[PDB]
Amino acid sequence: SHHWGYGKHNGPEHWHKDFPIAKGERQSPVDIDTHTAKYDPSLKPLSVSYDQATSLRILNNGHAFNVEFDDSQDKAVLKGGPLDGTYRLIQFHFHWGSLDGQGSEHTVDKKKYAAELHLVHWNTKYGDFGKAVQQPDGLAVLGIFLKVGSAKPGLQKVVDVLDSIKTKGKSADFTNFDPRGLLPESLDYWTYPGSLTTPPLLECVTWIVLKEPISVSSEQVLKFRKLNFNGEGEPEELMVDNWRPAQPLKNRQIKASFK
Ligand SMILES: O=C(O)c1ccccc1[SeH]
Ligand SMILES: [Zn+2]
Numbered sequence: 001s002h003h004w005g006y007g008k009h010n011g012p013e014h015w016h017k018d019f020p021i022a023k024g025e026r027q028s029p030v031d032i033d034t035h036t037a038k039y040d041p042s043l044k045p046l047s048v049s050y051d052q053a054t055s056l057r058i059l060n061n062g063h064a065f066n067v068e069f070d071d072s073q074d075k076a077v078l079k080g081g082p083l084d085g086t087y088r089l090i091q092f093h094f095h096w097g098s099l100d101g102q103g104s105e106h107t108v109d110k111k112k113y114a115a116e117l118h119l120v121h122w123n124t125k126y127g128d129f130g131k132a133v134q135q136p137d138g139l140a141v142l143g144i145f146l147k148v149g150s151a152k153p154g155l156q157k158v159v160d161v162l163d164s165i166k167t168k169g170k171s172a173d174f175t176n177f178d179p180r181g182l183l184p185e186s187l188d189y190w191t192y193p194g195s196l197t198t199p200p201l202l203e204c205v206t207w208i209v210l211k212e213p214i215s216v217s218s219e220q221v222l223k224f225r226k227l228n229f230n231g232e233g234e235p236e237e238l239m240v241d242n243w244r245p246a247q248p249l250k251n252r253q254i255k256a257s258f259k
Contacts, residue, residue, distance in 0.1 A: 004199045005063065005229065012244045019199050026203045027247040028194030029105035032254055037190055040255040046081035046187045046208065048142070053089060055177035058161055062168035062229055063198060064242055066091040067158065067177060071122070071129070076179070078121045078140050081257065082191045082206055087121035087140040090129055092179060094118070095197070096224050098240035100148045105197050105243045106209050108145075113213060114221055115146035116243070117182060118197075136193070138204040144182065144214055151217035154181020159223045167232040184212035188258040197244045211258070 001018060004010055016022035053076035057068045068091045069076055076089035096115035097103030104113035119142040122132035132138035157177055164172045188211040195203045227239035 001199060006242050015199055015201065019201050021195070021201045021203065024195070024201075024203055025250050026193050026195055026252065027201065028197050028205060028207060029107070029244060029246055030192065030194065030249050030252075030254070031107045031110060031246045032190050032209060034109050037254040037256045039259050040257070043082055043191070043255065043257050044080045046189065046257065047077075047079045048183065048187065049079075050076045050089070050178070050180050052076060053179055055174050055179075057171050058158070058165055058174040059171045060165040060168055060227060060239075062231075064093040064095065064239070065162070065165060065227065066093045067174060067179075074124065078119075078142060078208075081189065081208055082255070083140055084137070086124045088124055089119060089121050089179070092117060092119045092182075094146070094224065095243040096146075096221060096240065097243065098225065098238075100218075100221070102241070103243055104145055105245075106143055106145070106207075107246055113145040114148045115216070115224070117144040117146060117214070118142070119144070119179065119182075133196070133200075133202045133204045135204055137206065138202075139196075140206045140208060143207060143209040144184065145210070146216050146221070147213045148218055148221055149215040151220060152182070152214055154178070155216055155220055159220050162223050162227060166226075167228045167230060167234075169231060182214060184210060184214050186210070186212040188212065188256075190254050190256055192252050192254045194252075 054070040071090045078087045104116040126132040229237040
């Protein structure tokens with residue numbers, strides 16, 4: 001399935017035809033109504049252990065760019081909070097807008113941020129990512145909002161390699177990148193059961209959305225918007241507005257880690 005995207009003729013309103021789960025009971029993203037989310041005093045502390053993370057490569061996949069990690073040992077793991085067991089970091093990517101007033105997938109009281117970072121982790125009890133996405137507890141995604149303001153020093157290494165992966169299918173070596181440089185001070189979060197926000201839209205994700213956004217500069221997000229959805233020697237299509245809008249919450253409760 002090479003067909004879907006974010007255009008008029010292949011974007012989010014069309015996805016249900018090839019991926020009927022698009023209209024399912026636990027789709028993402030959602031609007032987080034802060035007044036309705038309930039503090040859950042039973043959530044255990046969240047543990048984000050990135051000291052031994054080993055980044056390998058950065059890839060333009062025609063939808064976004066992925067910063068990929070070595071997930072063949074327990075090097076960079078997420079556990080605690082709403083999670084049972086140990087989830088290994090496989091990749092991070094972003095979703096962003098053409099304009100600073102849109103780009104996030106989750107919203108907070110209908111507020112849209114300029115972008116959203118997704119750190120994707122898979123449950124080690126399922127052995128590999130492909131097995132994990134078939135299970136209702138297969139993935140844990142840490143979602144972090146981006147606002148435009150001060151630069152994020154720890155993002156600049158990502159920004160500066162984007163020229164080398166301008167078009168679909170281009171990759172570049174991307175070693176020794178430390179994802180701790182992308183985390184806000186507070187790990188206060190909301191959590192709910194949901195899905196991938198891209199086809200195949202599998203209902204395998206425990207979402208952990210941080211309350212505190214990070215800040216990036218106008219120049220940093222401009223470099224995101226100079227990427228291309230197209231392949232090399234194809235007509236230039238700027239990689240912008242690669243976000244899915246909020247989906248129906250249905251029979252779900254959003255829990256808060258904080259009072
Ligand atoms: O599009 C992706 O790379 C993806 C993959 C896994 C979980 C969530 C997302 Se939204
Ligand atoms: Zn994503």
